[PDB]
Ligand binder design. Sequence first.
Ligand SMILES: *[C@@H]1O[C@H](CO)[C@@H](O)[C@H](O)[C@H]1NC(C)=O
Ligand SMILES: *[C@@H]1O[C@H](CO)[C@@H](O)[C@H](O)[C@H]1NC(C)=O
Ligand SMILES: *[C@@H]1O[C@H](CO)[C@@H](O)[C@H](O)[C@H]1NC(C)=O
Ligand SMILES: *[C@@H]1O[C@H](CO)[C@@H](O)[C@H](O)[C@H]1NC(C)=O
Ligand SMILES: *[C@@H]1O[C@H](CO)[C@@H](O)[C@H](O)[C@H]1NC(C)=O
Ligand SMILES: *[C@@H]1O[C@H](CO)[C@@H](O)[C@H](O)[C@H]1NC(C)=O
Ligand SMILES: *[C@@H]1O[C@H](CO)[C@@H](O)[C@H](O)[C@H]1NC(C)=O
Ligand SMILES: *[C@@H]1O[C@H](CO)[C@@H](O)[C@H](O)[C@H]1NC(C)=O
Ligand SMILES: *[C@@H]1O[C@H](CO)[C@@H](O)[C@H](O)[C@H]1NC(C)=O
Ligand SMILES: *[C@@H]1O[C@H](CO)[C@@H](O)[C@H](O)[C@H]1NC(C)=O
Lengths: 342, 208, 228
Amino acid sequence: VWKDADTTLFCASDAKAHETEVHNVWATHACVPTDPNPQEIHLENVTENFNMWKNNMVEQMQEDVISLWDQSLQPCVKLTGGSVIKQACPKISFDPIPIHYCTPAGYVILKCNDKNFNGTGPCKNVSSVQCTHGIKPVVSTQLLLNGSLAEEEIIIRSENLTNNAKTIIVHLNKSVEINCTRPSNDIRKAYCEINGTKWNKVLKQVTEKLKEHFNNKTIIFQPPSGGDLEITMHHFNCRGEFFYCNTTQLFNNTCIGKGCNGTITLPCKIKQIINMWQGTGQAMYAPPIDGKINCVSNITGILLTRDGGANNTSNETFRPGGGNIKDNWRSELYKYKVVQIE
Amino acid sequence: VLTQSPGTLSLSPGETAIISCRTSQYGSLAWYQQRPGQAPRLVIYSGSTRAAGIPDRFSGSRWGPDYNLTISNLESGDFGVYYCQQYEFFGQGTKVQVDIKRTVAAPSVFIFPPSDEQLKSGTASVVCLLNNFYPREAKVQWKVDNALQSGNSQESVTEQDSKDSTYSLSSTLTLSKADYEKHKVYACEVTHQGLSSPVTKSFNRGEC
Amino acid sequence: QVRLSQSGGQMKKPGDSMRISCRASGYEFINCPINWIRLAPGKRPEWMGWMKPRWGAVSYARQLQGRVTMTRDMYSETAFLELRSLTSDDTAVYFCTRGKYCTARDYYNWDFEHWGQGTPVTVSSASTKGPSVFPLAPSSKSTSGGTAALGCLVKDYFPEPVTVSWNSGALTSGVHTFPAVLQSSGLYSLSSVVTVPSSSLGTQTYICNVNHKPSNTKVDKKVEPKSC
Ligand SMILES: *[C@@H]1O[C@H](CO)[C@@H](O)[C@H](O)[C@H]1NC(C)=O
Ligand SMILES: *[C@@H]1O[C@H](CO)[C@@H](O)[C@H](O)[C@H]1NC(C)=O
Ligand SMILES: *[C@@H]1O[C@H](CO)[C@@H](O)[C@H](O)[C@H]1NC(C)=O
Ligand SMILES: *[C@@H]1O[C@H](CO)[C@@H](O)[C@H](O)[C@H]1NC(C)=O
Ligand SMILES: *[C@@H]1O[C@H](CO)[C@@H](O)[C@H](O)[C@H]1NC(C)=O
Ligand SMILES: *[C@@H]1O[C@H](CO)[C@@H](O)[C@H](O)[C@H]1NC(C)=O
Ligand SMILES: *[C@@H]1O[C@H](CO)[C@@H](O)[C@H](O)[C@H]1NC(C)=O
Ligand SMILES: *[C@@H]1O[C@H](CO)[C@@H](O)[C@H](O)[C@H]1NC(C)=O
Ligand SMILES: *[C@@H]1O[C@H](CO)[C@@H](O)[C@H](O)[C@H]1NC(C)=O
Ligand SMILES: *[C@@H]1O[C@H](CO)[C@@H](O)[C@H](O)[C@H]1NC(C)=O
């Protein structure tokens, strides 16, 4: 017999000792090697409740990624709370590796394998594992990159859809590549390329799913209402550089209801002055590296907020969200929970 | 989506206020009190949970979609306007105001046709007066050629009289001159506890 | 102890913009959203939107989309509201609010335990318009055994208030001056009535004195029985 509980997990990875890359260096000292022959036990006649929005595994992963970033991406200048910290800021090797989280003795991770599981409630197919799958600690807003896909249908996730303050996670079942590039020879100017055909078909499927949760209302997409650039734009780090891309073209309502069939190119820019997601203030970095800077990623999820208000119209409006990086880990940790044996 | 009732409670200290709110969707419902000239205050949240500082005379209940705030043993500081809330949505409010008890008194009802001076303007106001009645609760309906009227009337009520503890009400039916000259019988119908039957006062346009 | 302090009240003309501030204290400012609620007399409270301090993420109420902007200053822990293209309907008392439950890890936005003290805002034209005063005449026959009702209708004035006396204040008994109502035209109107003995209708003169300070209007009107 077991019961839901929280404990201090440990980390596992395949970090290389010879690697100068940041995530590798961190995991070398913070994590243990992975198990070649993992052990998963499927539980019959066992039904368990899960809640991805109240999963303290998320809290611990958050602490780690913060620690990782603080000990790695040190700014030339750190502006926080009215004081200034001028450190050294050499360029780094930056490429997220998969991270497994595992339970100590006396504890074990229950895993939900319901193909249409939405994040909260009961689960029929429950298995017992020691570690999670390998999760890449990708920090981003608006789009979830390089994550896992939903097995069957597109899954809508929220702690409460009727609460306009709660973030919606859209979990895709087919990934769409986003190809971001800063060419060689304005150095800060960059761009992202997305296949308009694949994307708009996915986006259409997304609105169709959303209809199932919102009484067949008209589903309208809109740009973010306001906030800092990190959230009003698709913010992410590629090869150490901080990218800010404009996603207005990504959510074209015209294309989900001719001619947008082509290559979507998003205007991006590499900023050297950023707001730290760790939750401090501003950070200043060196200008981008020379040569072609390029990251091809899988768009595997979308972060949305839904418009509210004392209206009466039969259309629901959605806007790209994010900013709460804990949600990023929630999207990968949704099917896991820690339990203590007796 | 949130329907609060009644609009007004007229009660004496010591009595109990019963305020209801019907929601079209289940979820955490909260109740707020706004004292005159002061910021709203959280009284109840999650249906029945009392906020800190709120005495147990306040209690929230729920039957199906109907949530009720009951305030027992009304004190001076309890009067004001109350609101139910669910997420960003609020009820219309319930004004709980102090009422001084006296014997029932039927209203004296009067109707005033439009002035000839006003009829030169192009609009016609017909005024019905309900004088010196108790309790406050009263209904006034306008009838033009025996047709019930809706949306072309405004009421106004006095504060309870300091001396005789009665109320007085004024209802105004507003019509265009052309529209007014179309009909003959103008009547307002008053229902009130002091009346054994609804009382109608009326006049026929054109005749004195 | 959690506190929300708002900037002082102001008056505006239609078409203007407005900005108000809400300084927060007594808790970790980035952990919870700040909301803006406006209360107008005789209308439902209206949620305008929320703002999460961490990134300044905002959510505006549909019906205000385009007219409203919510910002924050992290250092001064102060939240800001801006509302553009003001009209009469924007006249209200504006509150900032924060939920009861707010930790570093979780919150519930909507149980508003914490309210700022409120910022009154009035939006109105500088224009004034004096009342039209129409008599509300008694009746036809003098019933020598009862009391009559008479008065005058004080219609289409702006802004508030008007006052009414009878016979230059000499007549007070039985007088009822009703609270004004706001008409669809955006102008105010009220009635003042008095009940008198029917026997005094052909003897006593009854004059309502209407005073409207904004339009600098004082008008006397004699209310007498119709002749037919
Ligand atoms: C649970 O597993 C059974 C056995 O394969 C499968 O038939 C069923 O579809 C699964 N349930 C869900 C919700 O995926
Ligand atoms: C997830 O499933 C649970 C259990 O059926 C349901 O109560 C909840 O509304 C669902 N949430 C979403 C976002 O579909
Ligand atoms: C992207 O998705 C493809 C298939 O959709 C997969 O083969 C590849 O490993 C993914 N890349 C990641 C997860 O970085
Ligand atoms: C993804 O899910 C949608 C329904 O949400 C479905 O129409 C589509 O076929 C799925 N695509 C897959 C499983 O590749
Ligand atoms: C990404 O786009 C660049 C041009 O912007 C192109 O040269 C490159 O081939 C693309 N990469 C992939 C993997 O498609
Ligand atoms: C976009 O993807 C489709 C496959 O879905 C492919 O046939 C098409 O060539 C792509 N467009 C471009 C411009 O590469
Ligand atoms: C994104 O680009 C569109 C393109 O016209 C522009 O109108 C919009 O202001 C941009 N948004 C941001 C946040 O820069
Ligand atoms: C959506 O697609 C249409 C047609 O290709 C285009 O005219 C419009 O500008 C697009 N909207 C954007 C890019 O925001
Ligand atoms: C996603 O993974 C690929 C390698 O699989 C990498 O090249 C790319 O930069 C990653 N994207 C981000 C945003 O880390
Ligand atoms: C959704 O919110 C209601 C109250 O607003 C709460 O009782 C319920 O448990 C919430 N649902 C989930 C799945 O968290």
